Design a protein around this ligand. Structure first.
Ligand SMILES: [Zn+2]
Lengths: 368, 129, 108, 143
RNA sequence: UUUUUUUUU
RNA sequence: GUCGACGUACUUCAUAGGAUCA
């Protein structure tokens, strides 16, 4: 699909995009998906002009989603990590399978896979995260060691050979282009971001990383329950009742007792034994989905709900605090867990404003 | 209508001490309520109390202090002979050596272990424990 | 002044909010029909669990063992059992619900 | 398999007895208005020495102030207080450990579950208030 | 019940 | 009269719930 192309040429603001002098006109479908997705990317609206952050996305040499997940992540110094992901996935096959290169010799092949598996386990500290945190910790250890000696390190755990010298080039390119757009060099703590190499991440900011990468992969959602999984990205209303499944090439191919139950993916493909392959995940549950599902028409609501401990309070005739359940699927979809949303009514609609938590709602219902 | 004034008094004390209040107001107040209360007071179940006087039946205000588990009235004032003292105190007390059955004899209103000593009996009013 | 007229329209809109809520609550108070109340309670417990420490559990277990309130020596249950009335499966639903609630309390 | 026990006689239980009280023996005593010491005299027809364990007294003190009359009954001066070498755990567990470690107490209790778990252990008689008095089950010296 | 040929900042 | 309304006597139908394992 054609989405970064029309992103750049709407950053030049050539409005009649279908009337571009193509060598031969491509399909309407990729352009239409470009329109819609970059509306969910926070880059475009029906207003036919891109956003200011959409123009800032155009200032980045990446995929539109990759540029966004850098762009919004400019918060709380967690930027080297998102650089590591946005440049690690940007070239295919980050790790050799170690399955197709030849006890006995198949046993030693499977033992190479076992030792690389022990490595990849020893890389990631938050199991709940994704296959994302695997490659993140791989980058965080690759440039951790001296790169003069890193080659034996890079083949101790039996990895790929050249695309990460390319990732060092791409990393320097990306921080250079950020330096070029904005003066971010001579700031004190931003040396973490200005690290040409990679060191150890934070402890709580990583769940916020899960938040801001949920902003990236829009409309790619699933659950868990042996895997037994449907795609919960119900903005497409016809992708349900099907057993969808992790990419077996991804190390999250049935990691024993993987906890979580909202499954974010990069992409998917179908094949052998009719098995489906959802590629690069991120795993989230309750609030930060609807924090960054409010960003477009991904999410709407219901009337407020009630009972005891859930009673709507009115601070005014045009202002209230109510528990609400958030709906997510447009024509065929579902609902998240409720939230103490505080809202007002502008021109005849109770327009949601703020996401009050549980204890704040208990105080605000004590007061009246 | 209103029949037992003592039953109303003991029920008002009981309710307004279950819920934790500190002083109770009980209207009307016969001589029997004063003497029943002086019997409860001697044993430490209530604090002092005071009769406020209009020119009518009169009201009382009692000062509670916690130590009261239950109090009540036995409503037909059954005649109690001298062995029936101990059948009565086995029926209406949760452990046969605390709590006092209170009864009206020719020698006054008194608990049962004072009507054992003086060797009297009479009718039966109520109980506290 | 005129800000008084603002005050009156504010108290007006509070009063009519109060009246609409009171009319709704009256009409719902009259509906006692154990399937309707049962449905409302079920989806309430669902929403309570989704939206909204051993010491409270140990006090609750202690009171439950002191009291033994959730076994079939209680007046309602012994009445239903001893008069063959719990073979009908709805009152057996209710009796089993009592018993499992008590078993939740006695768990450690 | 101690030197006292017969097949199931258990002849190290003898007058005067030593009973262990559970927390809902007290509740149904207060409810059916029997009295601890004389009630056990009126069934066993022998002297008694009711004993209460630190785990059980902790449980009574855990109930609260609605049940304060039973606590008043349990701090009575002639109910001895056997102390127990425990972390401080659930009452019924402490009773079962006492019974296994000495096999010379009879157990007064009223919950069915503790009744079953005692009944597995051979030779431990088992008082319980029923109806209007303290019925005893597995004691071969009754009448 | 892994199945990555290929590519441009 | 294989009659009805009762009055006695009796019969029968409705019992499984949770937890773990396969
Ligand atoms: Zn103990």
């Amino acid at each position: 699909p054609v989405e970064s192309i029309v992103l750049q040429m709407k950053s030049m603001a050539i409005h009649n995009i279908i009337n571009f002098p193509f060598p031969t006109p491509p399909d309407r479908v990729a352009l239409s998906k470009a329109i819609q997705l970059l509306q969910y990317l926070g880059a475009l609206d029906n207003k036919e002009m891109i956003t200011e952050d959409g123009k800032k996305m155009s200032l980045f040499p990446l995929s539109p989603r990759f540029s966004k997940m850098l762009l919004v992540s400019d918060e709380k110094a967690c930027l080297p990590y998102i650089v590591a992901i946005v440049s690690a996935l940007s070239v295919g096959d980050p790790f050799i399978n170690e399955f197709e290169l030849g006890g006995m010799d198949p046993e030693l092949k499977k033992e190479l896979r076992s030792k690389f598996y022990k490595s990849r386990s020893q890389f990631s500290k938050l199991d709940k995260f994704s296959d994302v945190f695997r490659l993140l910790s791989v980058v965080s250890a690759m440039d951790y060691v001296p790169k003069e000696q890193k080659e034996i390190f890079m083949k101790k755990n039996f990895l790929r050979g050249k695309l990460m010298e390319e990732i060092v080039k791409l990393r320097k390119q990306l921080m250079y282009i950020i330096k070029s757009n904005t003066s971010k060099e001579n700031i004190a703590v931003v040396i973490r971001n200005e690290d040409l190499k990679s060191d150890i991440p934070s402890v709580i900011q990583i769940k916020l990383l899960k938040q801001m990468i949920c902003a990236g992969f829009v409309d790619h959602v699933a659950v868990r329950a042996i895997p037994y999984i449907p795609v919960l990205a119900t903005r497409t209303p016809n992708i349900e009742d099907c057993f969808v499944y992790i990419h077996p090439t991804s190390i999250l191919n049935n990691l024993g007792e993987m906890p979580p139950k909202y499954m974010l993916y990069y992409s998917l493909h179908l094949g052998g034994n009719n098995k489906t392959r959802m590629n690069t995940l991120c795993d989230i549950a309750s609030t930060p989905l609807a924090n960054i599902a409010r960003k477009g028409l991904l999410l709407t609501y219901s009337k407020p709900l009630t009972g005891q401990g859930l009673k709507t309070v009115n601070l005014s005739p045009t202002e209230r605090y109510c528990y609400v359940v958030p709906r997510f699927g447009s024509k065929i979809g579902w609902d998240l867990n409720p939230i103490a949303v505080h809202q007002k009514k502008q021109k005849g609609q109770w327009t949601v404003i703020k996401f009050i938590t549980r204890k704040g709602f208990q105080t605000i219902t004590g007061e009246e | 209508t209103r029949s037992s004034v003592l039953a109303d008094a003991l029920n008002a004390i009981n309710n307004a001490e279950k819920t934790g209040k500190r002083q109770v107001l009980i209207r009307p107040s016969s001589k029997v309520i004063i003497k029943f209360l002086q019997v409860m007071q001697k044993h430490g179940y209530i604090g002092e109390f005071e009769y406020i006087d209009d020119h009518r039946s009169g009201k009382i205000v009692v000062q509670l202090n916690g130590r009261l588990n239950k109090c009540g009235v036995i409503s037909p004032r059954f005649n109690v002979k001298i062995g029936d003292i101990e059948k009565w105190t086995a029926n209406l007390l949760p452990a046969r050596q605390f709590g006092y059955v209170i009864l009206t004899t020719s020698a006054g209103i008194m608990d049962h272990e004072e009507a054992r000593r003086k060797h009297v009996s009479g009718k039966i009013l109520g109980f506290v424990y | 002044p005129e800000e008084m007229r603002k005050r009156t329209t504010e108290m007006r809109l509070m009063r009519e909010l109060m009246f609409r809520e009171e009319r709704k609550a009256r009409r719902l108070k009259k509906i006692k029909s154990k399937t309707y109340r049962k449905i409302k309670k079920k989806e309430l417990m669902k929403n309570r669990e989704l939206a909204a420490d051993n010491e409270d559990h140990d006090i609750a277990r202690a009171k439950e063992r002191m009291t033994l309130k959730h076994k079939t020596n209680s007046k309602w249950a012994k009445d239903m059992i001893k008069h063959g009335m719990t073979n009908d499966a709805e009152t057996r639903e209710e009796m089993e619900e009592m018993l499992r609630q008590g078993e939740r309390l006695k768990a450690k | 398999v101690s030197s006292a026990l017969f097949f199931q006689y258990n002849q190290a239980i003898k007058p005067p007895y030593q009973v262990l009280i559970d927390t809902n023996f007290i509740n149904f005593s207060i409810q059916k208005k029997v009295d601890i010491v004389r009630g056990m005299m009126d069934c066993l027809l022998a002297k008694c020495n009711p004993l209460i364990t630190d785990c059980v007294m902790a449980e009574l003190e855990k109930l609260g102030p609605k049940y304060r009359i039973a606590l008043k009954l349990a701090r009575d001066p002639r109910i001895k207080r056997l102390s127990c070498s425990h972390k401080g755990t659930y009452a019924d567990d402490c009773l079962v450990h006492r019974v296994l470690q000495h096999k010379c107490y009879i157990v007064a209790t009223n919950d069915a579950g503790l009744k079953q778990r005692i009944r597995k252990i051979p030779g431990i008689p088992l008082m319980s208030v029923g109806g209007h008095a303290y019925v005893i089950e597995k004691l071969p010296d009754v009448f």
